[PDB]
Ligand binder design. Structure first.
Ligand code: ZN
Ligand code: ZN
Ligand code: ZN
Ligand code: ZN
Length: 119
DNA sequence: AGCGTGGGAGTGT
DNA sequence: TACACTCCCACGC
C-alpha cells in the first residue's frame, strides 16, 4: 500500500500510486491550470480537463442525470445520488454520540450536527 | 432543517 | 490525457 510518488514541496505530505497523479498534483503548487473556460467571458480555469467539462454545464444548463422516481434532472451524478435518498430514506451517517440517535443522508449534514456536541 | 449545487480531490477504466 | 465515478467541503436558503 506504499505510495512511491511523493510530493517534495515544503509542508506537503501528499503521496500517490501513479506518476501522473503526482504530476497533476504538482500543478497545485505552480498554479498551472491549462484548461480555460471560453463561455461568455468566463474566468474559470482548471488543471484537469474533466473539471472544466463539468464546470461548463453551468453555461449550457445541461442536466444529464434524471431521477427515476420524480423525474427531476440534475447537473451531476453525485448530486442525483444524494437527492434520491430523499425518496428512499437512506441515511448512512449516524452521529454515534451516546444519547443522540439521529441519522443523516449526507456527510456534511452529520458534520454540522456533530458541532452541537461537546464535553 | 434538509437539500440544491458548486469547486477540489482521489481514483477507476 | 480523456472520461467516469465518488466523496469531502463549502455556501445558501
Ligand atoms: Zn504537494
Ligand atoms: Zn465557465
Ligand atoms: Zn427524485
Ligand atoms: Zn448527535
Amino acid at each position: 500500500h506504499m505510495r512511491p510518488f511523493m510530493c517534495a514541496y515544503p509542508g506537503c505530505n501528499k503521496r500517490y500510486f501513479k506518476l501522473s497523479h503526482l504530476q497533476m498534483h504538482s500543478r497545485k503548487h505552480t498554479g498551472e491550470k491549462p484548461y480555460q473556460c471560453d463561455f461568455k467571458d468566463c474566468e474559470r480555469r482548471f488543471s484537469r480537463s474533466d473539471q472544466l467539462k463539468r464546470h461548463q454545464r453551468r453555461h449550457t444548463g445541461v442536466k444529464p442525470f434524471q431521477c427515476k422516481t420524480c423525474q427531476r434532472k440534475f447537473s451531476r451524478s453525485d448530486h442525483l445520488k444524494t437527492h434520491t435518498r430523499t425518496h428512499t430514506g437512506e441515511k448512512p451517517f449516524s452521529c454515534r454520540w451516546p444519547s443522540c440517535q439521529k441519522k443523516f443522508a449526507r456527510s456534511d449534514e452529520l458534520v454540522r450536527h456533530h458541532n452541537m456536541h461537546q464535553r
